[PDB]
Paper text:
The Klebsiella jumbo myophage ϕKp24 displays an unusually complex arrangement of tail fibers interacting with a host cell. We observe the tail fibers are branched and rearranged dramatically upon cell surface attachment. This complex configuration involves fourteen putative tail fibers with depolymerase activity that provide ϕKp24 with the ability to infect a broad panel of capsular polysaccharide (CPS) types of Klebsiella pneumoniae. We determine the structure of the capsid and tail at 4.1 Å and 3.0 Å resolution.
The hexamers and pentamers of ϕKp24 are made up of copies of the same major capsid protein (MCP, gp372, accession number QQV92002). Briefly, models of the hexamer and pentamer assemblies were first constructed via rigid docking of the predicted gp372 structure and subsequently refined to our 4.1 Å map using molecular dynamics flexible fitting (MDFF). The triangular body also interacts strongly with the hand region of its clockwise neighbor through a series of salt bridges, including K380/E220, E398/R190, R554/E313, and R558/D163. In addition to these interactions formed between MCPs within the same hexamer, the hand region also mediates strong interactions with the hand region of an MCP from an adjacent hexamer. Finally, compared to other known phage capsid structures, the MCP of ϕKp24 displayed a structural feature that has, to our knowledge, not been previously reported: each of the six long C-terminal loops (residues Q582-S597) participate in the formation of a central helical pore with an outer diameter of ~2 nm.
Numbering used by the authors:
A (entry chain B): 339 to 597
B (entry chain C): 28 to 597
C (entry chain F): 80 to 287
D (entry chain k): 132 to 287
Write the structure that this text describes.
Amino acid sequence: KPAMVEDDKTYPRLEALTTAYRIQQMRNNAVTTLLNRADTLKSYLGVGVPHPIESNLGLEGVGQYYVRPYYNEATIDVLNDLNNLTSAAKQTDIQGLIVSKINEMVYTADQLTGYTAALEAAFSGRSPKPHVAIGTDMRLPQYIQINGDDRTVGIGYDYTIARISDLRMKDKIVMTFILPNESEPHPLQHGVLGFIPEYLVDFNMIRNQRIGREIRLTPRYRYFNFLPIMLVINVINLEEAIAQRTALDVNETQVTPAS
Amino acid sequence: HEFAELFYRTYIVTPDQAGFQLSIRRNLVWEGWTGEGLSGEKQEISKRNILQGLLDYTTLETNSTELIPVIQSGENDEQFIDPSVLPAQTVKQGKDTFDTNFLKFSENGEGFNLLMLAQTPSRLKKGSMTFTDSLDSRIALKQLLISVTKGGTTELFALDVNRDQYAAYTATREYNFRLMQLKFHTSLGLGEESTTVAGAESALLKDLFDLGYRIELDVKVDGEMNVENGNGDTSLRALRLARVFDKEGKEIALTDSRVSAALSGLTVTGVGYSLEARLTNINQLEMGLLIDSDVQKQGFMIPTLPPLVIVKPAMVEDDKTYPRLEALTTAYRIQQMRNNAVTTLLNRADTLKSYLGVGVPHPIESNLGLEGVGQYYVRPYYNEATIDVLNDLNNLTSAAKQTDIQGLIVSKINEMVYTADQLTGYTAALEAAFSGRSPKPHVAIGTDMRLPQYIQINGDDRTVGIGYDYTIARISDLRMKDKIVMTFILPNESEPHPLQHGVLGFIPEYLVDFNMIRNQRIGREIRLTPRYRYFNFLPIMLVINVINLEEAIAQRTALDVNETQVTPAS
Amino acid sequence: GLLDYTTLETNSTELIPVIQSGENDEQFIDPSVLPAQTVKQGKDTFDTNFLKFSENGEGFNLLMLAQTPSRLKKGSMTFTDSLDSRIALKQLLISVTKGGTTELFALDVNRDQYAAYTATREYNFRLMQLKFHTSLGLGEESTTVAGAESALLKDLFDLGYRIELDVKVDGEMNVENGNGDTSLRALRLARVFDKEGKEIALTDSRVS
Amino acid sequence: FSENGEGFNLLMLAQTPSRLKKGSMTFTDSLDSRIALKQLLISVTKGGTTELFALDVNRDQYAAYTATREYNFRLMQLKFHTSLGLGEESTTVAGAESALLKDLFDLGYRIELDVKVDGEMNVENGNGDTSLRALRLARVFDKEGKEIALTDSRVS
């Protein structure tokens, strides 16, 4: 801005600066880290293959000292995997398919990772239950939230559901196990946010024979990942199944002689 | 009447203005400017709006502090690898364009100078390599390029190494004061789907991969760097095949005949590496992202309309030639408040077909030929859909058929409303433009006299959506027959605002009564001059068409079973 | 009127150009390019066309054209008839030529944000100005004469490419005299669009 | 007079050598409050001979730019609607009396041309446009301040 007249019209108040900072840092870097962690787990562990504890040196996370590595991927085809008998009950059936699949994924992960044993070993005098953290886009959660007659989103498992407007996580469901009640880094957590505060420094610069006031913020933050466990599932072709009705996969018993 | 005031809020104006003018400030983001060193380009470049940043991902991600190696022909062609193995890659930071390649390991050779090596065209004008360039606290490897060779065929693997056990430079307990070293010892695993660089699945390890096997490559690399003057050297110490695994993660001896035959001809060597460093200057010589604001202000003005009058002989009272005074008022109220509004709505529908295409969003300030100031707060969006209830409705019993059709149509409405909220970003616009509370997007449903009773009887799966409010508008006009029109409406505001769908430009007019001896006759007349117009702001709307409604009710359509290829026909 | 709309909505004061065929022919486009159409006001039917752009001075008098036979029988053009607060371009025409083939499009620029005569205070005190600069788009599945496709823009429309024409039009009008003028300053295509909303260069093989 | 295609960026056009040597100019390099037409260059042609008359049209009532009530908030417009004349003793190239208009000047006649020039200018990045829209001869004046008919034998 010009360094002879204050201008709150071209440059707004400090709030615009702070909110631009807040958006950039606290959303885009985190999304990059999460998706890159997904991709690197894909690259190293294959698909759906448990690994012996501390036998996968070459991928961060002190969590590998307590839990077997595990990454699995799944695909839901709502158009070809939904069951209807009446148009009035289609959304409940959609919820049924999605919740049943997520429950199956959670149970299989808990089965082959042995997370319960690690959890009970790490903390004594208490036996908490594994907590599922689920993130997704701005359209799906209300197809997870109950409507009339529906069952719990994961039986016996407590959960949290998050909202994000960014367009990578469109029709995406990402989940893992975390500890909600701890504020200091543990090997069991998914990751921690290393943070170093920045203070504002405002002063004049003479750049290429200039006269102008300059405002600078240098951020200091870094995202680290601990638990090498995560499940990535995507749902495709939803609105078509909602608008176009499918029904009644029928398997003939070939009593009409062909076998 | 309900309909006209539903989409067009009444805004009254005194007769002393020819129109109303709006002023809106926009806050926008953009990097680098013309100045006078080149005075580059006419009509300059484009500037982005910040609100688009909430939905996009390369809008804010900028890097200028990164110290990436840069090629200069005839200057540093010796420090880089031979480009005959891998062609140089192109990278962009700031506004410079240049080619890069992986730095190579040298054993007995001289160390390089990372600080100097990363001079980019932006720096050179700003000054070449002054004192106060100091490397950041952490410097780490990102990729390693090992050549797995099978029978003369070379495949390069850009193994992402930035994420691993130990790649962060560590301060030394002794020796000099700023000598940071690299002590790198681990095994890097090649997964069964670990792709070759530049796409393409690994075609060499397929033989082990088809059996589901994997190889363990241990890597022996050391290095050192000075964080004051940018000097340092790195050397590879050892690299060889260490272990081979099965699908169960059980050690398999290299002496087995099959794996040994599959491993015949395998030699692995390290080609080069790439190293990340950030130039933490305390004085700094970058221009960040410039932030400004611009103001676009619009002029809206309101004309008159053709007059209406009744004439009658000026000696008598009549209910024959003139019933009371109410006739003109009723005619005028029709004139104003129904046909013109409906015509405006339909013309907007046609216009949005003409411009936006079917069901495709556009970025912010993507078009200016569209009417309405609301175009700066949301992506434009127009989508249409039709439901063939005859070919789509589910029938179980003849008793619940109306409930079934109601559920189908309401589910379709929910789909469109939710996907509109997803694609437009209207929700965040409401969150921002008003800060006292976060109101739910208030939805209005306008349609003819036919449909509404098939929308609300009983058994609503979801009303119009959870936490959504609705208002049902009904009208008798024909050309709206058998359609559904919906949009987004603010019920709590009265003044012009970019989040209104429309505002009814209205100035009062009063009766004109006096004698005119014209055409050489005498009569009493009542001149009525209406002056109003409809002004609409928000460029978002959704429409739904229904066909075969009569066909489905009076003819059964059930169970389009989908036989799935069990009767042998493949 | 309760059911149909056309039983009402009468015009009797709007000023529309009228062909006298020999008395004001110079101020219309020639009939060899676009045949005149018949329109009705009140009980009077007549011919109308588009006012030619003033390529070289010679402004036009608006009241000299708006004598309908109903106004002819009403005697001389009344001296006190003044224009309304609003005067705007109701319809803009474009002619695209490729290889000698001429086609006309009807772009409805009515009610657009930058197409209303605004009061100007630099000259006199009853002068209205027009200042028209925007991008007039052409429908990918519409905009031929009232919609639908064309015979010269197939290559873009089949793949669905959208064209933006930048327009520079300036105009002035006097709401007491009836003298006014209108001129086209510049007219050409600048950008080409698609579904994705990202422009394509004018040098790509298909677009070129 | 640029009419079609690109306009002109004035800030590009004023890159004097000293400005090259000094580097770059400061932020928000803004134009003058007013913009003026310092000269209008018209050409007179009679039979194939062209003579240039440099009419300094500055300080006439309508050579000033004003802000628009639409578009951007920095766009200033130019509307120059007036009559320009060429006289016997007014400053002109090849003397106050030129060769192509000597006949009228000897008869004491001075010609008046109606000029209609309009334009656009922005004071933020230096881009703008101007177009010549109308220019012809309209009235002829004698040594006595009364308009003479164009159909009269001598003037015609």
